[PDB]
């Protein structure tokens, strides 16, 4: 199908020309609709050098609809739900939650790509913003007690490395 052909093509490109600090691909090539991504927090940001695994689950009509994405280890970020689900503009078409994200942020369409999703997630990790309320406690503590948020961010980084 076109979804499988498209996911196979994106995987080929990602393996040929990998983006910095990210490894991603199907957990097993007999099911290209379930990928695992490993993302490192960029230097000089809140979660710098942390290593964060996530699962991308693609819909049957990909690339017309975006995947769902979920971190599978602990996170504490205003835009990541407590169960790990990622809440960013690029993972939604212009029609769903049309105002729940920044007007400047790109929406899903077939010209987007897995590479563009993961780069957007990296930016989100670097630049937490408390105006998507996916994690209420994280958004409030980002707004009201950022020192405590920073302390937790550093613990999360250290645990993600086992140190």
């Amino acid at each position: 199908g076109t979804a499988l052909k498209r996911l196979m093509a994106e995987y080929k490109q990602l393996t040929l020309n990998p983006p910095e600090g990210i490894v991603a691909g199907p957990m097993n090539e007999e099911n290209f609709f379930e990928w695992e991504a490993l993302i490192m927090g960029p230097e000089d940001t809140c979660f710098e050098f942390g290593v964060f695994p996530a699962i991308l689950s693609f819909p049957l009509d990909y690339p017309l609809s975006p995947p769902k994405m979920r971190f599978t280890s602990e996170m504490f970020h205003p835009n990541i739900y407590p169960d790990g689900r990622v809440s960013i503009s690029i993972l939604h078409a212009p029609g769903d939650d049309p105002m729940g994200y920044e007007s400047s942020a790109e929406r899903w369409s077939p010209v987007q790509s897995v590479e563009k999703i993961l780069l957007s997630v990296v930016s989100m990790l670097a630049e937490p913003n408390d105006e998507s309320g996916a994690n209420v406690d994280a958004s409030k503590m980002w707004r009201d007690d950022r020192e405590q948020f920073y302390k937790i961010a550093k613990q999360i980084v250290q645990k993600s490395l086992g140190l």
Partner: peptide, 27 residues
């Protein structure tokens, strides 16, 4: 082949974690 691709993906994920540890400890 699918087999080699899959083992290479595992190797590269292991290596990403090892590199992150290096950079974290050198900072």
């Amino acid at each position: 082949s699918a087999d080699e691709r899959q083992r290479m993906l595992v190797q590269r994920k292991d290596e990403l974690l090892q590199q992150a540890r290096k950079r974290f400890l050198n900072k």
